[PDB]
Amino acid sequence: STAGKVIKCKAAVLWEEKKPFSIEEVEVAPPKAHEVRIKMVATGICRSDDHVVSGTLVTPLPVIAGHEAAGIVESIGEGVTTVRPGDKVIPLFTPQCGKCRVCKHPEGNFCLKNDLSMPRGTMQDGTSRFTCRGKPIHHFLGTSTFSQYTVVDEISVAKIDAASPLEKVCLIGCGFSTGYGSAVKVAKVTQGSTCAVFGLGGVGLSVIMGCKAAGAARIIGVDINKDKFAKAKEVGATECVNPQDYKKPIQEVLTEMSNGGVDFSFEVIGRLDTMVTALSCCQEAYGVSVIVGVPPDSQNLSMNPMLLLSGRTWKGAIFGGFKSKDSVPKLVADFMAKKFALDPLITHVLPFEKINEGFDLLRSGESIRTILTF
Amino acid sequence: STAGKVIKCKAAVLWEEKKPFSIEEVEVAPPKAHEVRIKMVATGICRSDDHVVSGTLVTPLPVIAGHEAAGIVESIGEGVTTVRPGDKVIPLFTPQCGKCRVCKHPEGNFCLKNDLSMPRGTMQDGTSRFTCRGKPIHHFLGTSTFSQYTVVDEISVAKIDAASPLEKVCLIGCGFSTGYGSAVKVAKVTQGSTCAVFGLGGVGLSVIMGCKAAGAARIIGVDINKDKFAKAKEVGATECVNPQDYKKPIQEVLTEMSNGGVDFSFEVIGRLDTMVTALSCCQEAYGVSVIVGVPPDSQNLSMNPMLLLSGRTWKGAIFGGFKSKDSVPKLVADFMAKKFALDPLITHVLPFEKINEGFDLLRSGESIRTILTF
Numbered sequence: 133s134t135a136g137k138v139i140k141c142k143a144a145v146l147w148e149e150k151k152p153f154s155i156e157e158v159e160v161a162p163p164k165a166h167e168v169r170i171k172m173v174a175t176g177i178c179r180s181d182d183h184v185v186s187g188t189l190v191t192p193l194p195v196i197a198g199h200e201a202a203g204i205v206e207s208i209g210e211g212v213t214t215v216r217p218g219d220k221v222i223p224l225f226t227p228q229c230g231k232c233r234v235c236k237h238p239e240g241n242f243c244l245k246n247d248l249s250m251p252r253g254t255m256q257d258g259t260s261r262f263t264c265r266g267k268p269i270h271h272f273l274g275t276s277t278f279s280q281y282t283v284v285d286e287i288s289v290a291k292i293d294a295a296s297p298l299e300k301v302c303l304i305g306c307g308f309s310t311g312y313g314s315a316v317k318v319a320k321v322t323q324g325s326t327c328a329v330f331g332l333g334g335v336g337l338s339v340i341m342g343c344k345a346a347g348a349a350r351i352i353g354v355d356i357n358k359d360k361f362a363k364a365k366e367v368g369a370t371e372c373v374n375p376q377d378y379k380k381p382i383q384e385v386l387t388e389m390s391n392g393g394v395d396f397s398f399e400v401i402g403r404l405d406t407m408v409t410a411l412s413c414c415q416e417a418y419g420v421s422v423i424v425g426v427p428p429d430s431q432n433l434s435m436n437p438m439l440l441l442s443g444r445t446w447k448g449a450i451f452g453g454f455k456s457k458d459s460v461p462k463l464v465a466d467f468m469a470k471k472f473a474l475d476p477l478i479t480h481v482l483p484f485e486k487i488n489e490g491f492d493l494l495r496s497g498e499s500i501r502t503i504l505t506f
Numbered sequence: 507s508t509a510g511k512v513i514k515c516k517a518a519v520l521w522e523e524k525k526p527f528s529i530e531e532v533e534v535a536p537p538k539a540h541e542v543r544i545k546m547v548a549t550g551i552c553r554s555d556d557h558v559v560s561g562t563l564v565t566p567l568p569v570i571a572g573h574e575a576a577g578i579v580e581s582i583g584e585g586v587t588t589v590r591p592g593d594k595v596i597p598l599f600t601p602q603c604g605k606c607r608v609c610k611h612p613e614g615n616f617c618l619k620n621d622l623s624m625p626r627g628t629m630q631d632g633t634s635r636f637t638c639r640g641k642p643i644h645h646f647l648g649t650s651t652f653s654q655y656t657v658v659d660e661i662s663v664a665k666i667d668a669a670s671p672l673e674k675v676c677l678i679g680c681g682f683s684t685g686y687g688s689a690v691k692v693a694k695v696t697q698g699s700t701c702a703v704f705g706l707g708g709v710g711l712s713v714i715m716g717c718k719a720a721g722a723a724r725i726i727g728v729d730i731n732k733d734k735f736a737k738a739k740e741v742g743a744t745e746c747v748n749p750q751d752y753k754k755p756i757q758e759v760l761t762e763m764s765n766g767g768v769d770f771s772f773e774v775i776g777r778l779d780t781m782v783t784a785l786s787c788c789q790e791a792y793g794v795s796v797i798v799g800v801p802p803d804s805q806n807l808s809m810n811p812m813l814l815l816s817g818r819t820w821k822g823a824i825f826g827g828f829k830s831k832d833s834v835p836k837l838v839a840d841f842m843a844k845k846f847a848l849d850p851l852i853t854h855v856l857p858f859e860k861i862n863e864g865f866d867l868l869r870s871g872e873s874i875r876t877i878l879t880f
């Protein structure tokens with residue numbers, strides 16, 4: 133009943149940095165060629181969405197944020213072949229165009245069509261599908277999931293199992309896949325190894341899940357909020373340390389605890405200092421450190437390259453290294469077969485209209501993931 | 507006969523930084539338990555030896571430098587099982603104790619018994635075998651090859667083929683193995699890939715040799731000294747670029763030349779700026795950059811961690827990642843079997859007494875490797 137028509141619906145519009153979202157009516161244009169309009173069902177609150185608010189992650193404003201979500205296709209534009217109306221879908225904040233040199237590379241996943249490296253806040257065609265108060269509103273990472281309806285490019289959506297529980301599998305759209313893949317795919321954690329995970333939010337807990345799935349013998353969680361430790365141990369941490377408890381820098385503490393450095397470390401916070409600490413704490417000759425946290429816009433870290441010359445490997449990744457469109461449906465299928473759990477990440481459920489309370493819960497340190505229901 | 511006796515011989519002593527080597531008589535003590543005294547036959551001039559002179563690489567002075575060499579065992583201390591008097595040997599500036607967690611790790615080679623991290627300038631037992639004018643003289647990297655005789659710990663020497671030409675295979679003691687391994691073992695260059703090699707000295711040429719051996723389709727040499735380009739092309743570079751010739755930064759040039767970034771880059775100079783440029787020029791999603799150049803003492807680089815978050819891998823290595831004592835004899839056997847060439851690295855052959863002339867050739871940009879012959 134809405135195909136080819138503008139939809140008026142509620143969205144969470146961010147007009148200004150460091151302000152609450154405004155829940156108000158927007159106009160969502162119908163999909164153009166190779167575009168898909170989605171009725172959203174559930175969306176998670178990822179710290180990266182908060183980074184938009186705080187100006188940590190710069191993207192044009194005003195904007196409809198949200199990138200961790202699931203919904204049901206309302207309509208498809210001309211030439212769409214990979215989804216149909218009524219399909220369950222997860223928007224892909226990292227696209228998979230299938231054509232660029234990264235998509236063709238066996239390891240690569242950061243498709244050249246992404247809107248993360250130099251955000252423009254548009255559809256692929258450089259325009260917006262959103263109007264609010266007669267004003268155009270930017271997209272975010274091609275997804276804009278904080279809206280009852282969004283429009284995405286076909287390369288930014290994956291069809292998932294029709295029997296999927298959308299209020300759970302929305303986490304496959306960012307935090308779970310990112311953390312789990314950072315361990316299993318990017319780091320390639322080995323059986324019997326020692327891991328250190330800096331930051332025990334939804335993404336860091338997913339890193340722990342992946343380290344445990346990979347057979348790590350020791351998984352040391354690191355957080356300045358000791359309230360995070362109990363859940364980290366539930367999902368596989370063997371021990372947790374709070375840097376604030378120690379006189380010495382935590383890289384020295386972790387090096388001593390691991391009898392000369394860890395096999396794999398993960399920065400899952402977004403601070404320059406913890407990126408360098410996490411590198412330093414991995415064993416100097418054969419250690420691997422993976423950056424997962426989003427750094428503050430345009431800021432450089434300082435480090436001694438002798439940390440690398442001795443043999444360390446330093447890498448980072450978006451979305452756990454997963455080729456998004458190939459991987460998301462498989463991750464959903466694995467979830468349905470109980471190959472991993474998502475409930476440990478979900479601490480709070482709210483209606484979409486309580487989005488600002490959901491961000492309050494994240495900022496206070498209380499929540500891991502709040503799932504918003506439309 | 508010399509066994510069990512002090513040897514008086516000629517060595518090149520560096521009494522203080524930024525001075526010529528002093529060629530004079532030293533006393534070399536006999537080897538203690540698990541030590542080996544070696545009559546030197548040939549030693550190369552590596553830029554790392556010059557770093558000791560320039561204060562780029564800090565190690566205790568006064569010192570007998572030299573780490574790239576080959577010679578013949580004169581005598582063995584009690585308990586030595588791996589070499590005998592008369593054997594051809596290469597000193598190992600990276601030891602292989604076989605017992606530490608690094609030596610037992612499949613991918614580690616920076617043995618914890620090394621004297622590079624935190625240089626003491628002694629034997630393993632914390633003492634020196636060298637005196638000169640009644641003063642103790644430090645060792646360098648457990649090797650000290652700028653001497654007619656040296657004493658090394660057993661874990662710092664490898665036996666090699668008795669028919670080895672020592673005036674060539676001394677390069678397996680540092681520059682060839684470092685560069686070649688950095689390509690084939692550390693980076694794991696792939697067939698059909700595009701490589702960029704920053705610095706076309708003896709080590710960078712050995713990186714090119716490894717990239718060509720691994721089947722790279724394109725190998726871009728980068729040097730500010732265009733006199734280095736002809737030999738780079740002879741050993742496999744498909745093209746060479748001088749950053750001084752361009753208005754743009756060379757990372758932008760190399761990204762354009764490679765249609766979006768190279769597969770593998772190598773820093774083979776020792777400058778913070780070229781370490782960051784080399785990382786930046788590899789493809790942002792799947793590129794790999796290897797640091798080979800020794801950085802200036804205690805200086806930190808500045809970089810944006812978004813370079814890693816998109817998917818790049820950044821690593822470094824000592825001695826090409828080779829486990830030294832296992833690898834050196836095999837590299838010499840491979841050379842004897844014509845699997846690689848060393849003559850392209852050798853531009854000058856001088857008597858040992860002309861060490862300062864050999865360093866002046868390196869500093870002027872006029873040599874690759876000078877081999878000093880005893």
Ligand SMILES: NC(=O)c1ccc[n+]([C@@H]2O[C@H](COP(=O)([O-])OP(=O)([O-])OC[C@H]3O[C@@H](n4cnc5c(N)[nH+]cnc54)[C@H](O)[C@@H]3O)[C@@H](O)[C@H]2O)c1
Pocket residue numbers: 178179180183306307310330331332333334335336354355356357360375400401402403406423424425426427449450451452500815
């Ligand atoms: N690379 C990707 O594709 C990707 C995906 C998803 C999230 N992210 C980023 O990953 C980071 C974590 O996201 P999240 O799990 O949703 O966030 P979160 O829930 O805010 O978790 C971060 C955790 O870090 C802890 N912390 C803060 N400061 C320190 C410190 N100094 N030392 C140790 N712990 C500290 C903090 O207490 C919290 O539990 C954020 O920067 C996100 O933007 C990146």
Ligand SMILES: NC(=O)c1ccc[n+]([C@@H]2O[C@H](COP(=O)([O-])OP(=O)([O-])OC[C@H]3O[C@@H](n4cnc5c(N)[nH+]cnc54)[C@H](O)[C@@H]3O)[C@@H](O)[C@H]2O)c1
Pocket residue numbers: 441551552553554557680681684704705706707708709710728729730731734749774775776777780797798799800801823824825826871874
């Ligand atoms: N990691 C290891 O185990 C290891 C082993 C051997 C050597 N090294 C280091 O590797 C580096 C190279 O050694 P080498 O080949 O003997 O030295 P080298 O022969 O002096 O070669 C260095 C090359 O870099 C070139 N160069 C200088 N500045 C620039 C610049 N700004 N941009 C481009 N090219 C430039 C220079 O012209 C020369 O051809 C040195 O820092 C050594 O200390 C490290």
Ligand SMILES: [Zn+2]
Pocket residue numbers: 227228229230231232233234235243244245
């Ligand atoms: Zn693509």
Ligand SMILES: [Zn+2]
Pocket residue numbers: 178179180181199200306307
């Ligand atoms: Zn996210």
Ligand SMILES: [Zn+2]
Pocket residue numbers: 601602603604605606607608609617618619
């Ligand atoms: Zn060892």
Ligand SMILES: [Zn+2]
Pocket residue numbers: 552553554555573574680681
């Ligand atoms: Zn060297």
